[PDB]
Symmetry: T
Subunit: 64 residues, 12 copies
């Protein structure tokens, strides 16, 4: 059985790096992370000093 968690990663460099930021966090806390699916991408402009790319991912991990 796989479970997914819905995470938004952020990066000041790129959408790819924002995806990685989310996946890195998942791997810090979860065992057996297997894949991720991109579900949204965006850019924060007003609340930040530097534009921040965001990529939201469903991160799948195998239970047991």
């Amino acid at each position: 059985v796989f479970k997914k968690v819905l995470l938004t990663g952020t990066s000041e460099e790129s959408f790819t790096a924002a995806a990685d930021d989310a996946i890195d966090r998942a791997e810090d806390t979860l065992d057996n992370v297997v894949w991720a699916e991109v579900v949204d991408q965006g850019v924060e402009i007003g609340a930040v000093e530097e534009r921040t790319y965001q990529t939201e991912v469903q991160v799948a991990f195998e239970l047991d």
Copy 2:
């Protein structure tokens, strides 16, 4: 990194109050709740004495 949880709040008064019901529950248990996105709305009619409005929300919170 933000994480979202998918919650359905309920209210006998309104769709807004049902959203609040979900958000209230998130804030009881989670730190750093930042926003919520409505993903569905419905009304329970048959299994209840009074019509119950429901609003399903992705509730986002900041990790760390």
Copy 3:
């Protein structure tokens, strides 16, 4: 077996009340109304004296 009818209710007060307007009509004519799912919301501005909120719902009822 459940069947759904696709109804648009209207209200000069709110989206919740417009949903109720549709559900009320369903209950006038149908037995065993069980739930409703919101599928669209809108506001009529030009053809009306007062802004009219509309909520379109699939209203489910149990056959037999």
Copy 4:
């Protein structure tokens, strides 16, 4: 010919009032506003003192 503008209204009271906030702004600046379609709803929690409901609408107006 109708044209639509994509506006997000806000309210500390309700999703209906947030829709109105967007429509009010459209009517301040545009002639012949005819209808609005809700396309998204959300709640701002972290960046505000009071929860703020938001309703995003396509607001249609008649050209000429």
Copy 5:
């Protein structure tokens, strides 16, 4: 308040049995599982000895 978890169950027999596999796992770990909504179906062919049907479900459970 209901919460949903997004689970992918698997089966070498059928899509129905894959849904059950996910629901069984939810019921092992959660109290008050109430319903599930199918959100995706697929078949694993290359990484397996026997074709494996998968059904991804949002599994809803009542909080408290």
Copy 6:
């Protein structure tokens, strides 16, 4: 001209059998049923003694 009715069939056995349950009901009451399109699938867990699979279908029938 074809017309569709939106029916949810149920079964304690499978999603296929739940589709059939809806189609059977349509054929009891309508002439000239021609096809059905699956639009949703779900499982009722809490309100039932045995898990009940549901399949919602648009059932098309030829008018005249």
Copy 7:
């Protein structure tokens, strides 16, 4: 309150004429038809002597 019926009209001439075919049928049987929304378009090629255009519409009519 408006209600919609989901009709597929057909024509050997065009998608517009297929929409009209559905609307004509609605107006034969229903009072107060107000609008229609196109939801799908297709072409039947194999089961027919001449290609047949089809347009599926939600046809809205005012109740009472």
Copy 8:
């Protein structure tokens, strides 16, 4: 950089002609119109003497 405007054209003849009606209006007021994407089609029946076809288009134009 391209920008899109969301226009609904109308015609008493066809969906194609309604698309053209929107595009014509865009070309009256904008330089460098390059393409249009159909996003919705509908028919106005009740508020008009003759059925009026409508086609909503995103009309893209090149900035600078």
Copy 9:
């Protein structure tokens, strides 16, 4: 077993004729074309002398 190919037909006359243009091409090269489903419509304005309507279709054909 049916297979679909995703084709974009073009016409300087109409969306219907653009669909036909795609279907004609499919029938030139494939046996047993049975139906087509419209998936997108657009208009090319800038790269052409005359506006060109386009209709993208999944064209289904029976294998064997």
Copy 10:
């Protein structure tokens, strides 16, 4: 690089078996079939002696 082909399988028994029917055909003609994603399900009722379940799948295969 993976490529997908869009196939509709059929079965007089079940949606699972209809998926298999499509996948079987892909494996007859293609090397390195790896997975399939269900994209639609339906039932043919009028043109057949026995109800025929159909499952449409994107079947992915590895190029080279």
Copy 11:
């Protein structure tokens, strides 16, 4: 009240840089740009000497 404009940025380097190209243009002409949401990505191959990545964004800005 926020308003969104729908812009397609382009880049010969990456999808991230194409998003930036759109956002840069918005910031040249608009005050109070706050965020952007990616709605589509594509690559122009035939009409260009070098492949050109495109990213279409809704760019939100605060009115007043």
Copy 12:
């Protein structure tokens, strides 16, 4: 007439490079590749030594 093929490219570097990987393969085998539309993005984590970005594209090419 344009035809599209649905390809998933892969890269250990970025989503842009994964799109290119798919487009490169299309250009190896097809004449007159004109554009590509991104339809999905994902990351393979478990079955690989290094995270592999994937971008799925519809690649359009002109027939004849």
